[PDB]
Amino acid sequence: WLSAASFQETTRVLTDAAINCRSDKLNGLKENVIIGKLIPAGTGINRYR
Amino acid sequence: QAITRAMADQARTIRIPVHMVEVINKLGRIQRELLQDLGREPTPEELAKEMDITPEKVLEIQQYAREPISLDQTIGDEGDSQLGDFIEDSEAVVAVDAVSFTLLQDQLQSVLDTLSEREAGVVRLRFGLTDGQPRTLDEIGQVYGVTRERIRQIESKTMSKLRHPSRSQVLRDYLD
Amino acid sequence: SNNSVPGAPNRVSFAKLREPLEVPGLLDVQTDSFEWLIGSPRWRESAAERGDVNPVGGLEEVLYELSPIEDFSGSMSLSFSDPRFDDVKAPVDECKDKDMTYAAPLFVTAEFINNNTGEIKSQTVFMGDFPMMTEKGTFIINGTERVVVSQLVRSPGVYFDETIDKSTDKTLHSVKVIPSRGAWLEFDVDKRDTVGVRIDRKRRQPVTVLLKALGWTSEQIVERFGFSEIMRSTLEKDNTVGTDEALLDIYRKLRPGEPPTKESAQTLLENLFFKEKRYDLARVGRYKVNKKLGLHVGEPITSSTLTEEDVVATIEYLVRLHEGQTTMTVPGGVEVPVETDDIDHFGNRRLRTVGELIQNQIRVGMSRMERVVRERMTTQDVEAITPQTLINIRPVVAAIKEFFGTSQLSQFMDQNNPLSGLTHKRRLSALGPGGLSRERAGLEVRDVHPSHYGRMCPIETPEGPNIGLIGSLSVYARVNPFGFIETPYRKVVDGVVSDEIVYLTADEEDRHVVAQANSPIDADGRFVEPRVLVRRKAGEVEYVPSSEVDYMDVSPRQMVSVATAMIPFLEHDDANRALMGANMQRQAVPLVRSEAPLVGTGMELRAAIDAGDVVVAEESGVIEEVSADYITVMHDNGTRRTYRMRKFARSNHGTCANQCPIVDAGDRVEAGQVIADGPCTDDGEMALGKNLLVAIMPWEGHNYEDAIILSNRLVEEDVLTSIHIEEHEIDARDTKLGAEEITRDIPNISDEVLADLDERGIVRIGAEVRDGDILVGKVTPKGETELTPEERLLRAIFGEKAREVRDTSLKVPHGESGKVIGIRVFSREDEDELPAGVNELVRVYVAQKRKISDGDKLAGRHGNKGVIGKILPVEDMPFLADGTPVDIILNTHGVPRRMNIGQILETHLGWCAHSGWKVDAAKGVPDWAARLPDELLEAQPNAIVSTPVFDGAQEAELQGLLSCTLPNRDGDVLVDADGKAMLFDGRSGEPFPYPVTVGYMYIMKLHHLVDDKIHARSTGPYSMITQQPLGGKAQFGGQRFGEMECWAMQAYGAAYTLQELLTIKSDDTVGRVKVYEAIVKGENIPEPGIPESFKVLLKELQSLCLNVEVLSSDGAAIELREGEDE
Amino acid sequence: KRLKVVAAFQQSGNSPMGMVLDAVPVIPPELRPMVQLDGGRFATSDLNDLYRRVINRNNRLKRLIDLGAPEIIVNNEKRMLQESVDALFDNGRRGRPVTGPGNRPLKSLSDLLKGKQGRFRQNLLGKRVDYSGRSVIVVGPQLKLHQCGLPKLMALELFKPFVMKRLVDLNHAQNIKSAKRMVERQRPQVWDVLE
Amino acid sequence: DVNFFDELRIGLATAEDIRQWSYGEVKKPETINYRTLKPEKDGLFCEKIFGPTRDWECYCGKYKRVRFKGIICERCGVEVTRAKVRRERMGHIELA
DNA sequence: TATAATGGGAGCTGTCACGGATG
DNA sequence: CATCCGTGAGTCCAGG
Ligand SMILES: [Zn+2]
Incomplete structure (x- = not known):
């Protein structure tokens, strides 16, 4: 929902997500940039990290 | 009566008491009475004498009458620029200034050393480094295991011992 | 000669001889408008000469619409008339200086009429x-020179x-x-x-429903529209x-929720x-409807309202146009053309000037x-009512103050150079209240219309997202009393051009x-060929017999603007670069002294005079005394008018408005x-730049991609x-800890x-200032908070007692530097009236003598822009045979692509x-220079000429003149008939293999100089909410690493870089501080923390009843440097 | 479509009661800050006038209820409270937006997240960075492909705490505080240091 | 304050949840005082609720030193922590 | 805070292209 | 396959 909310139609996204009680596993590019975690790509992946 | 009362009471984003509102409405009244009388807006000096005879307060009142502006309000030409994006957080911490403080801690640590354990004792006592509080000196010597206020005696045994890291000028830099 | x-x-x-009419007063767009508002003498006369029957001023009009103001009873009646002005409360210069508004107080005569008592109390x-x-056609609102731009709107x-x-x-x-x-x-x-x-x-309903609502019989419907x-x-359906x-039906569909009376639906x-x-077509609203329907066409403008006749004749216009009628x-009305209207036609598009806007x-x-009036009527008693008691002007002063202060049409006068200001007064914006938005505007509103x-002008318009929404008014154009745009045309009787000139509106020229x-004209006035080039409605063109020519254009340069x-x-030059070339001249910066361009168009003269930023003599006379300070002129009648010179003054845009005297003492001068x-x-001509010796060649790459x-x-x-002047301000207010005081301590x-201050705390005039230095020494009392136990200790050792006053001085901003050219001090003590709370207020003016440097943006008049790449030593410069080094080396590559060979x-x-x-006149006058006017057959070195647009030099004559080129002092010709010449590479010494096109080109210094544009920041101020850095050079903010830029990081896979920028470089409150420490202590960069922005987000979600929780790998909600409690 | 909603309230023990509020959360102050400017005038965030609106009407409801006012009066108050809380949560959503001074629609809570300027796309997907700058560019035919010409003035502010480090290193400045003053005064030394 | 948390959950917030968050009910529409320029009590900026204006400085002034940490002054009920908490402390209004 | 007084007032105007609910 | 409301409509800089 984090990726979706910061994409478009944020009010739509949040209402739904809060109703479906959707948990978000912060495992994505958009998802990670927001919280300030190393992006799961490039030098971010555990393989190189 | 309920309107004008509740109006004066609720309308101001920053509340002013009833009388203060009564004043500003008298001030606006006497202004419009002098307005048609002098073919020009009347000087603060002119307004003062007629109603309250004090000029300093009229300057003050006219600022109380001033209505605030929204942070969220923008500049007409470009729809992106909002006022709040131009307000420097006077609160937040300067990087260098806070760091320089920390380097001042590294110099007083090189001061707790050349000083004795008795000497670095009263230092952190009345100035309150670890404490955060400056205890009254007639309590400091009694709370300390050494009496005859020998802790004030060790104080002067320190004041000149502090001249040496002061003659090293390593503390001289952090005052200017 | 051009303008003699x-x-x-x-x-x-x-040229072809241009004698129709001189360029009209350019500022008249601003002038004549405001004259109508106040009903000035010159307007009423201009109303007479134009033959305007019963002219009514803008102010007079308002009062008559208003008057009289009666209540529901009709018992009371308030009415206004005879508006008049005093002398201005202060002269222009003093207004600019004392940040007050240039104004002259308004009066009116008001009488309170009563029908019951019969008495009338009448006062001013x-x-x-x-x-x-x-x-100069500008306003002065709070010491800043402002301009009201004319609004292009949709005519009623x-x-x-x-x-x-x-x-x-x-269809x-x-x-x-x-x-x-x-x-x-x-x-x-x-x-x-x-x-x-x-x-x-x-919602939609049958139209007959409306007719039977008006009262028209169901039989008249069959008659009129049968x-x-x-x-x-x-009528059948x-x-x-x-x-x-x-009526009931219409009522029920208009306002649901309300009881339908037969008397409430009729009302x-x-x-x-x-x-x-509730309804009002303006004078234009009435006039435009009438023309379209052709009823009461001759009858004067008295109806301000829509009528039944208008409703019917409208539906009749709809049906006939539907089934093909023309x-x-x-x-009861004259014949009218029936067609579909174009909303963008300047006959249907209305230019509302300053007067109407105000x-x-x-x-x-x-x-x-009026609302307060009607409230103050029912309150007070009938006998004690005066207009002084009914009237509250506070909402009137508040509505005129607000307009000049807030509106999108009261603008900071674009003041780089005189032309820039001149064009600013003649902008035509479609934006603003009552107009349209920038997102509302499609592609039809912006592109060039035939009626323009x-x-x-079709050339002058911004390059930006504002394109086509802002335009300049054409040269010979003017605004008619109904807010449309007329234009001068020559009258042709029967194939014969007459000097009689009539102005035509857009739709009138269509007819x-x-x-x-x-088109060639006989020495008497007759056309040469029967069929000539002809402009026709809808921008269509066809050859037409000379019998049928009605009018002709005044000048070839009639379509363009002052800048164009x-x-x-x-x-x-293709419209694209030509466009820039016009937009850019208004960006030129005034140089220390200025040269008139070797090549001109004639417009350079009138533009400068009309601009108002030069000094013109009112009445003829002789220079009785001249100084750098002022000029005094002895008139013939004996009177003396002295003109004071503007000397080193700061414009709105920090350019240097400095005026110098032309005339010498004892010169006889005419008005x-x-x-x-x-x-x-x-010498009274627009000198936007300098004349530069150009050379068209790639030169060792330093001019690659349009650099110079x-x-x-x-x-x-x-x-x-x-020269560039900046103004710096600082004040001393009353604080809660005392008052700020400006002191040298x-x-x-x-x-x-x-060392460079005076005894006050102010810097001394003439001193030099760098950034960081102190201009005005101001100190404020700091809050008595418990000083550091670590600094308490540091104050006992050195025994120095702390002062309760923190340094709040005005230091010189980064980048700025120069000489302090003037101090302006206001005190509350010396009775200088300040805003409440202020005590001493200081301004410090600093001038910079900025020589041109690398990165400065130079441009010509042809959209050929570019920043300075390299400035070579004068010896490195490719030079002509006689030793003269060229001035500017342009890149050949960037000329044919831009279609702008005008620069060539x-x-x-x-x-x-x-x-x-x-x-060569021997063997007669050559066939190429046959059309060339006699005056140009012989020309001196450094001679000024004119190439008026759509006239001037032709490529034949230009080729010819290249052969006529006079030799230099050494008797040698320098360039050839091709226009090129041989150069010597000042670096190698060897000559360049091929002849290089050399010559002189006029170059302007645009207001995009690196000294302004450069900026950088390590740490600085930070956002109050998001805790990110602030933005802009003025705020010493950092750059933005946008959504697009992050993509660029991710694509690379530079995860650490990208993170670091979004974390410890941005809004990690604790991080940025510890990164500073790590750097200055020379350690390693720490692991970034949590973005304070993200924290804010979760609080913004929470506050919207969105229970957001961050869970660790187990499933428990963790704390974010905060706790939960009730 | 109806099940897509109802099934969601079923699954997780996520009560549908929450759609109706008995209490409305109040966002922290520093996130709706109120600031005095240099002009003495105060600049506040919109949310405070929206919050002020809900409280003033919610309290008027308490007085009306207590006073035993007729249903016609009380109900009206409740209706207003609804629009008060609604315009707080999402302004303009239902009906015409609440205007401040200048017929200006007030930013609501949800307005802080919406679209471009919102908290998501403007402040999280892209931020402003320290240690950065901007200037005009110029061709540099001399340079090698891996080089760029960084202005002497630009570098000094970019590497500002980096230069201060080597100033107190090589003893040009006695401490970190003086090192700063050396850079801001642009003393001749720093040009050697920064190199 | 470790950086690695596995999931971020969002749900519809209970009326009770609203109250568990809030360190107090705002009961007055008032913001600050017109003279003292201080956050008026039980208001929209009340220091009892959202925290102190200045670091470790209680409202009524009975406590002004760093020495008192986590102390709740009895004269005006203002916990002594940094104003840094005024960015994190929630409020709530109790609709009748 | 006791003469009698009893239902509001500005609208806002020149997009554009699309999906989803309704026809 | 055609209507009514709600949501989208490049980036960075600049200024007042
Ligand atoms: Zn207390």
């Missing part, structure tokens, strides 16, 4: 201080549109009636052949019949469309005080046929002549050097840093004008 009218330098013009009321416009009236149906593919016709203010009303035709109407965007089957199909049932139908209170006579705002203020010809200006006409060989010119003005190479001569001779600062042609004519020339 003022006393101006002789600029010889290639104060209305407020009224903003007056300067001679009834408009017809043809829309094609997607499904049925049949459907729509109408829309647009009031100056009020309720909407549109009649549209279905694909079902049934006419419908939408009122204020309510000639069509689509109306017969409408008509739901209900009956006058009562119609609002009158009120929504036929009363002066013309129609309204019963007027409308006045009308807003009046209706507000001679009214609005005629115009010949292009350059200053672009030599304009017809040689209207330029006696002293200002910035970018040489300069001779160090331009730096050593200040040729491209300007600043905590913990040596007597070295303070100028370079040729530039050289011919530098060297001089002489046509």
